[PDB]
Structure formats: C-alpha cells, structure tokens
Amino acid sequence: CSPGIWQLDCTHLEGKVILVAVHVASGYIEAEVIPAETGQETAYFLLKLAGRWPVKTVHTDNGSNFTSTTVKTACWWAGIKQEESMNKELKKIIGQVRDQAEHLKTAVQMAVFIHNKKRKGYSAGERIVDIIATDI
Amino acid sequence: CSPGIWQLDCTHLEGKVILVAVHVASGYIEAEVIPAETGQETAYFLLKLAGRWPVKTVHTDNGSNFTSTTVKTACWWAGIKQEESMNKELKKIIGQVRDQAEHLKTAVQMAVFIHNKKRKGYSAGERIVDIIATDI
Numbered sequence: 016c017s018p019g020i021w022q023l024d025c026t027h028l029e030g031k032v033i034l035v036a037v038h039v040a041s042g043y044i045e046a047e048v049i050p051a052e053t054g055q056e057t058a059y060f061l062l063k064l065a066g067r068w069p070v071k072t073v074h075t076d077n078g079s080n081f082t083s084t085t086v087k088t089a090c091w092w093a094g095i096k097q098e099e100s101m102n103k104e105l106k107k108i109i110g111q112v113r114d115q116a117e118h119l120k121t122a123v124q125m126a127v128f129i130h131n132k133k134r135k136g137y138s139a140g141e142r143i144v145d146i147i148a149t150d151i
Numbered sequence: 152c153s154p155g156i157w158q159l160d161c162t163h164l165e166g167k168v169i170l171v172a173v174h175v176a177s178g179y180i181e182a183e184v185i186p187a188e189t190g191q192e193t194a195y196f197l198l199k200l201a202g203r204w205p206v207k208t209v210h211t212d213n214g215s216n217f218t219s220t221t222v223k224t225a226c227w228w229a230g231i232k233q234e235e236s237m238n239k240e241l242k243k244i245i246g247q248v249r250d251q252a253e254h255l256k257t258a259v260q261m262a263v264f265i266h267n268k269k270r271k272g273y274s275a276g277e278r279i280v281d282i283i284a285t286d287i
C-alpha cells in the first residue's frame with residue numbers, strides 16, 4: 016500500500032469517543048479519546064497527524080465523517096485527499112489493561128503503546144518508520 | 152545525539168499552556184495545547200509520545216516538571232529514563248499564522264506542520280524517520 020495512506024474511524028466505549036488512525040501499510044496506530052464525534056475534533060486530529068507524518072490520502076468506514084466544512088478545511092490546508100481487525104485487537108488490549116488505569120484515555124494510550132511495540136518480525140512501530148524512510 | 156533522546160518544556164501564550172517535545176537529533180517537534188501545566192497532562196503526553204516513538208530519555212529545562220508521582224508513573228510503565236531556538240522558531244511561526252485560525256491550538260498545530268515539513272537538505276520530519284530507521 017502507498018506509504019501515505021491512512022484509515023480513520025471512531026469506536027465508542029464507556030460513552031466516550033475514540034478517534035483511531037491506522038497507517039495501512041504498517042498497522043501502526045494513533046488514537047485519541049474525544050468527547051464528541053464532531054467534525055471539529057476530526058479536523059484538529061487530522062492537523063496533528065499531518066504535522067507528524069506524510070498524510071496523502073485518508074479512507075474511512077463512514078464517509079459522512081469527512082463532510083463538514085471544518086474537516087474539508089484541514090484536508091485542504093494539509094494537502095490531504097480522500098480515498099479491519101486493527102480496531103478489534105486494540106479494543107482487546109484496552110479491555111485487558113483497563114483495570115490498571117482510572118481513565119479510559121490512559122488505557123487507550125497504553126493499548127496504542129502495546130500495539131505499536133509488540134513485534135508481529137518487526138513491530139508496527141518499526142515497520143512504519145522503515146516504509147516511510149525507504150520511500151525517501 | 153542518541154536516537155531516543157527527547158526534550159520537553161512548556162511555553163505560555165494567550166494564557167494557555169503549550170507542551171513542546173523535540174527529538175534532539177532531528178529537530179522534529181510534537182506540540183499540544185494544555186489548559187494546565189499539571190503533572191497529569193505531562194504524564195498523558197509522555198504516554199502518547201512513547202507509544203508513537205522510541206523514547207529512551209527525556210531532558211527538560213525545568214526538572215520540577217518531572218517530579219509528580221503521575222509523571223514518574225508514566226516514565227516507569229513506558230521505560231523512560233531522565234537526563235534552544237526550536238521553541239523560538241515555533242513561536243515565530245505561531246505568530247505568523249495566528250490570524251488564520253480562531254483557536255491557539257489550531258495555530259500551534261499549523262506551526263508544527265510548517266516546522267516539521269520545511270526543508271532546512273531534508274526536513275525535520277525526514278531526518279527523524281531517517282535516524283530511527285537507520286538505528287534499526
């Protein structure tokens with residue numbers, strides 16, 4: 016898969032929203048707990064993601080996610096164009112480590128840590144950096 | 152500089168706090184607007200950062216930043232150990248693009264985008280991925 020392709024969806028838990036971004040070629044995840052599945056949060060998140068990685072295209076399982084003017088604006092400024100078990104495993108790990116933390120967001124980040132680091136023989140963390148580097 | 156060394160400080164603007172993390176070998180930045188210079192925010196931020204990069208050691212210009220139990224806990228779980236003009240330039244870019252955005256945090260992320268991407272002949276975005284990849 017092209018190095019700059021990302022997938023973006025929301026899953027819910029404890030009545031809070033989790034924005035989940037996956038680098039499709041590597042399986043590396045960036046996640047964030049947001050209070051509201053609003054376009055403002057998706058725009059802001061896209062801005063951070065594009066700042067830290069080469070984000071060329073973004074796919075989603077809910078196209079209406081990318082429809083507000085706020086989201087379209089972020090995509091415009093950042094040069095972003097429109098176009099799994101990752102979410103299932105992530106929710107598995109969240110479940111496993113949820114007791115170890117008071118807040119859901121702490122567990123969410125713990126699960127991102129585990130997922131990105133556990134070697135599957137590189138780990139998603141290693142594969143993404145490898146891919147993007149090679150592409151340079 | 153060792154590939155896994157990071158620097159972490161807070162600067163203030165419009166009466167809000169900006170957590171700024173710099174990968175010392177590359178100059179790549181991750182920033183976030185937080186409401187309160189509290190240890191809970193530093194812990195949470197460290198968790199995200201360690202999830203997405205190899206974070207071995209963290210230096211700061213304010214050691215008391217790393218003193219609360221919440222911060223020490225995040226460092227423990229993540230395997231993190233304790234140990235510029237980057238902040239000045241970042242504040243420059245924020246200033247330049249501040250008018251283009253309602254919220255300070257939107258401008259902060261815009262400035263991170265510019266900084267990470269502008270080639271200085273790679274850009275900080277390219278140098279960090281190169282370094283960490285080579286180190287693999």
Ligand SMILES: Cn1c([C@H](OC(C)(C)C)C(=O)O)c(-c2ccc3c(c2)CCCO3)c2ccccc21
Pocket residue numbers: 115116117118119121122125190191192194195198220221222224225226228
């Ligand atoms: C509230 N709280 C938390 C944690 O929330 C924040 C990180 C946002 C502060 C939470 O929801 O349980 C921590 C804590 C910090 C680090 C950390 C972990 C928990 C779990 C494993 C990974 O590393 C913590 C520590 C001392 C007092 C209070 C705390």
Ligand SMILES: Cn1c([C@H](OC(C)(C)C)C(=O)O)c(-c2ccc3c(c2)CCCO3)c2ccccc21
Pocket residue numbers: 054055056058059062084085086088089090092251252253254255257258261
């Ligand atoms: C409030 N607001 C913002 C923006 O705040 C959020 C991103 C958090 C929603 C803000 O503070 O000005 C945007 C916006 C979205 C993208 C974007 C930019 C501004 C500037 C350049 C980079 O790309 C936006 C668009 C339509 C309506 C309302 C908006």
